[PDB]
């Protein structure tokens, strides 16, 4: 979609806040939010592309100014409700309970070792998105291509600043999960992936550095040939 998270080229968001050194986790709640990612993934709440789509549907002012891991909480709840796995009424009741009793214990539960084994395997083994397809890549290094002007409302990785722009293919990476389907609940539908180079003048006009380019990843449907 065309949401405020698509910030490339936006002005006026302010100076970078870079506090001289910071911890990995700024509060205990951030550790919980971070670790809910593998837990909700294993439980079928969402895949990685659906996860991002959930963040993209936040209130825009909340997205721009809230702590990063709060975005993750919002997407868990979004997919919890979507899959019927989270009852909102029970969530709101428990929230008030922990508002009023912040030191109350968590529910009794078994420390199932398979869940920790899952964490170790995911972390060190990875979750590769590369996929084999039968068809060869349509494009090759050096091809001049143009990026689609399509503006889907669902999930995509089509930053507004590259739509309709012309660039040169720099590398073919193989085929990967396609966000425009996976993030919208339509499956992996893998497509070949390329890096395409766009000059700063092509993207920004005369305000563009004559000695700078942006390299942007394009799945095959995003681009059409201009010159082989």
């Amino acid at each position: 979609m065309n949401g405020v998270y698509d910030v490339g080229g936006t002005d006026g968001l302010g100076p970078i806040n870079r506090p001289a050194d910071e911890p990995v986790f700024r509060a205990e709640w951030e550790k919980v939010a971070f670790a809910m990612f593998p837990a909700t993934f294993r439980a079928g709440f969402m895949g990685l592309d659906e996860f991002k789509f959930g963040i993209e549907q936040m209130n825009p002012a909340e997205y721009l100014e809230s702590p990063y891991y709060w975005h993750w909480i919002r997407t868990y709840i979004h997919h919890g409700v979507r899959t019927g796995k989270i009852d909102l009424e029970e969530l709101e009741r428990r929230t008030q309970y922990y508002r009023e009793n912040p030191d109350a214990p968590l529910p009794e539960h078994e420390q199932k070792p398979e869940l920790i084994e899952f964490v170790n395997q995911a972390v060190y083994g990875g979750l590769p998105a590369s996929r084999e397809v039968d068809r060869p890549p349509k494009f090759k290094e050096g091809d001049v291509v143009r990026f689609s002007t399509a503006s889907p409302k669902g999930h995509a990785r089509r930053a507004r600043y590259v739509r309709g722009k012309t660039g040169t293919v720099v590398k073919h990476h193989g085929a990967y999960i396609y966000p425009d389907t996976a993030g919208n609940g339509l499956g992996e539908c893998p497509e070949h992936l390329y890096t395409v180079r766009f000059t700063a003048q092509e993207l920004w006009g005369p305000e563009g550095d004559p000695n700078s380019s942006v390299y942007y990843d394009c799945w095959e449907p995003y681009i059409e040939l201009v010159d082989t």
Binding site: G8, I16, K31, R99, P102, L106, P107, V123, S212, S213
Partner: protein, 203 residues
Amino acid sequence: TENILRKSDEEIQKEITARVKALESMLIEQGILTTSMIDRMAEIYENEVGPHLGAKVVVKAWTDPEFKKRLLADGTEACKELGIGGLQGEDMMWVENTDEVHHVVVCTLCSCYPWPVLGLPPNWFKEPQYRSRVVREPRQLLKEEFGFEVPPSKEIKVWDSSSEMRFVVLPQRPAGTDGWSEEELATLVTRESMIGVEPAKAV
């Protein structure tokens, strides 16, 4: 930046804490989340996985031309030679800074960062201020925010990482380090230098 509509940080943290604890309690009751699972993820990204791994890769590349060739040809396989790889770095491509080219990495659409070599990203990398501007005025941003002056004749390549392919910057080896040991060289490699927002440490 001042927003007259915004609550205090203390009130925001109090509300988030309650909402997160409530959600946590529900996932625990569903049997899909446990406190031990949470503690393991925290321990890994606080202590086991961080930019010291990426620094090992960089120094090997600086000191082993054959390994550097493998690293630039297939970053994932080369890093696996050192036992480095996994979640959010399944596909890595390393790009080499030179006297004519400078590389900087961003994810304008979100926060994607090569965890197996750098750990979790610092907050500024995920935030809208860096993401919006670095694709539009990278030369001005590097100078004003990081004190890093890239001469206008030198090409800046901004890698906007929109897919699962993770781009990692191999910084140039600082002058004055001929014959240094791998441990001494690693002290000059920073996560910032592997993002491209700074060069490797001088001196």
